Amino acid sequence: MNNNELTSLPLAERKRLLELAKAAKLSRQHY
């Protein structure tokens, strides 16, 4: 049996980049 195949992919991070953008109320390109 296999598991968390989606975590082995980069799409999970592409999703998070947007998530962090909504969270980051200042959306400053800089950190």
Coordinates of N, CA and C in Angstrom, one line a residue:
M1 N 0.8 -1.2 0.0 CA 0.0 0.0 0.0 C 0.9 1.2 0.0
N2 N 0.4 2.3 -0.7 CA 1.1 3.6 -0.7 C 0.3 4.6 0.1
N3 N 0.9 5.7 0.4 CA 0.2 6.8 1.2 C 0.9 8.1 1.0
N4 N 0.2 9.2 1.3 CA 0.7 10.6 1.1 C 1.4 10.9 -0.2
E5 N 1.0 10.3 -1.3 CA 1.6 10.5 -2.6 C 1.7 11.9 -3.0
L6 N 0.6 12.7 -2.6 CA 0.5 14.1 -2.9 C 1.6 14.9 -2.2
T7 N 2.1 14.5 -1.1 CA 3.1 15.2 -0.3 C 4.5 15.0 -1.0
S8 N 4.6 13.9 -1.8 CA 5.8 13.6 -2.5 C 5.9 14.5 -3.7
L9 N 4.8 15.3 -4.1 CA 4.7 16.2 -5.2 C 4.9 17.7 -4.7
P10 N 5.3 18.6 -5.7 CA 5.5 20.0 -5.4 C 4.2 20.8 -5.4
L11 N 3.1 20.3 -5.9 CA 1.8 21.0 -6.0 C 1.3 21.4 -4.6
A12 N 1.7 20.6 -3.6 CA 1.3 20.9 -2.2 C 2.0 22.2 -1.7
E13 N 3.1 22.5 -2.2 CA 3.8 23.8 -1.9 C 3.2 24.9 -2.7
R14 N 2.9 24.7 -4.0 CA 2.3 25.7 -4.8 C 1.0 26.2 -4.1
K15 N 0.3 25.3 -3.5 CA -1.0 25.6 -2.8 C -0.6 26.5 -1.6
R16 N 0.4 26.1 -0.8 CA 0.9 26.8 0.4 C 1.4 28.2 0.0
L17 N 2.0 28.5 -1.1 CA 2.5 29.8 -1.5 C 1.3 30.8 -1.5
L18 N 0.1 30.3 -2.0 CA -1.1 31.1 -2.0 C -1.6 31.3 -0.6
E19 N -1.7 30.2 0.2 CA -2.1 30.2 1.6 C -1.4 31.2 2.4
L20 N 0.0 31.2 2.3 CA 0.8 32.2 3.0 C 0.6 33.6 2.5
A21 N 0.1 33.8 1.2 CA -0.2 35.1 0.7 C -1.4 35.7 1.3
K22 N -2.5 34.8 1.5 CA -3.7 35.3 2.1 C -3.4 35.6 3.6
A23 N -2.6 34.7 4.3 CA -2.3 34.9 5.7 C -1.5 36.2 5.8
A24 N -0.4 36.4 5.0 CA 0.4 37.6 5.0 C -0.3 38.8 4.5
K25 N -1.0 39.4 5.5 CA -1.8 40.6 5.3 C -1.1 41.8 4.6
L26 N 0.2 41.8 4.6 CA 1.0 42.9 4.0 C 1.4 42.5 2.5
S27 N 1.4 41.2 2.2 CA 1.7 40.6 0.9 C 3.0 41.2 0.3
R28 N 4.0 41.7 1.1 CA 5.2 42.3 0.7 C 6.0 41.2 0.0
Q29 N 6.5 41.4 -1.2 CA 7.3 40.4 -1.9 C 8.6 40.1 -1.0
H30 N 9.1 41.0 -0.3 CA 10.3 40.9 0.6 C 9.8 40.2 1.9
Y31 N 10.8 39.6 2.5 CA 10.7 38.9 3.8 C 11.6 39.6 4.8

